[PDB]
Amino acid sequence: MLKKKQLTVLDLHPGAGKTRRVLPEIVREAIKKRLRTVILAPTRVVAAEMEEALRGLPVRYMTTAVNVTHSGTEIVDLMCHATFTSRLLQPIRVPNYNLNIMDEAHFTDPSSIAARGYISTRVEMGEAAAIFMTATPPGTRDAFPDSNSPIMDTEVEVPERAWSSGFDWVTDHSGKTVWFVPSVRNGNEIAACLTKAGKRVIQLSRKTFETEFQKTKNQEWDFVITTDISEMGANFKADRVIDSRRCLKPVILDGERVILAGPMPVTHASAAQRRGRIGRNPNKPGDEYMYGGGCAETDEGHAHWLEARMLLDNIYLQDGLIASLYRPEADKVAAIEGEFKLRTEQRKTFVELMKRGDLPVWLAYQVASAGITYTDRRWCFDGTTNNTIMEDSVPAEVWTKYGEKRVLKPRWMDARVCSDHAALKSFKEFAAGKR
């Protein structure tokens, strides 16, 4: 596995022991062979769980999510997928790792796709080895893989709105359920309906994951309502998954705006990972998976793969060469390699808009490529009337850094900046010059 020029896909079924059993064995062998190694965790929560499996091994944890005193002699580093891509983009030295291990390698956020593209290109060049750990590699067509214990799979109509009757099976259950919804707003409505019915509900999404996931351990709960982020190594002690089988798809229209299309069907990989939350305990057969739609290849034309090309075009590899996407997911976007390569100063603005600005990659690219500097927010107010952002069904308004009240009407509209209350609040602060 560890020889140069090799990329191995470790595709043992969900719960088979890739993280807690196989990963320490790989790490021990890597250290014996003096291979400078990186381990990439999808989230801070998985990074903390990996420290538990790797305890006693010399690993440098490049995150505040792990409280350990390092020795300074570690040749194995562990960091998040997004941290890896971020450090590659910045004028910071990233070692040319001999062995690159990515856990939960199916993650489809732009920084994870870009990390796979960079790593697989270094392997193709003959410079490095890599191991991608996931039960569901790109292009998998099996939504029902093996499990540690038998699962009861049932196709059933799943509510996507509050209900008063006709879904008694949802609330008659006396165990713990993990319910995958397509968006934070949709989960808020289902959670309120379950709370009104006397259930204890925890809600998880990308921005709240670290804080709220700890509630699954510290308090008794009946339901967890989560977006797709829980497909990335989130472990629950549950006996049922309810799966809408739906997700939102960011889509770039006419190369000039991004909408959140759908809800539409999930891919087979996502459905398998959502089901994969249960059936993990061989002593508890009969966990239930209730699913409310079919699968489709909704990653084709999805904006994350175009955004991954924007990130890769701006990462140095060798002279003017540019890393390609990982071959099995490269047809998901139609893009010219190098078309998003920016000059030094525009690249710095692009990076800062993503890192400090917290803007989506596509939107950060429009601003930086227009020659606008990080702190110049005039573009948040000079778009067309059709770009007016709404708050409570009237135009949203902010006080600019000049002290003037203005309607929020960005030059480029990306639906992700106002898809829920928290996102709109963050974008209003950005438009006002507050970060």
Ligand X SMILES: COc1ccc(CN2CCNCC2)cc1F
The annotation places the binding site for ATP at 12-19
Residue 281 carries which side chain, given as an amino acid letter?
N
Write the CA distances from 427 to 100, 184, 310, 380, 410, integer angstroms.
35, 17, 22, 9, 10
Minimum Å gap between C-beta 83 and ligand X is: 4
Q: Residue 21 or residue 435: which is nearer to ligand X going by CB?
A: 435
* Structure-token pair, residue 183: 């968006």
Minimum Å gap between C-beta 70 and ligand X is: 5
Asked if residues 132 and 163 have their Cβ atoms less than 8 Å apart, the reply is no
336-341 long-range CB contacts below 8 Å, 24 or more apart? 337/309, 337/312, 337/313, 338/313, 339/309, 339/313, 340/309, 340/310, 340/313, 340/314, 340/365, 340/369, 341/313, 341/314
Minimum Å gap between C-beta 233 and ligand X is: 18
Minimum Å gap between C-beta 309 and ligand X is: 24
369-372 long-range CB contacts below 8 Å, 24 or more apart? 369/340, 369/342, 370/411, 371/346
Of all residues in the shown chain, the one whose CB is closest to ligand X is 62
Cα distance between residue 156 and residue 321, in whole Å = 50
Cα distance between residue 392 and residue 373, in whole Å = 31
Q: Residue 31 or residue 251: which is nearer to ligand X going by CB?
A: 31
Q: Residue 58 or residue 433: which is nearer to ligand X going by CB?
A: 58
Residues forming contacts to ligand X in the complex (CB under 6 A) are 60-63, 70, 83
Minimum Å gap between C-beta 62 and ligand X is: 4
Q: Residue 99 or residue 290: which is nearer to ligand X going by CB?
A: 99
- The single residue listed with the structure tokens 């790593």 is 119
Q: Residue 85 or residue 426: which is nearer to ligand X going by CB?
A: 85
Minimum Å gap between C-beta 401 and ligand X is: 27
Q: Residue 61 or residue 107: which is nearer to ligand X going by CB?
A: 61
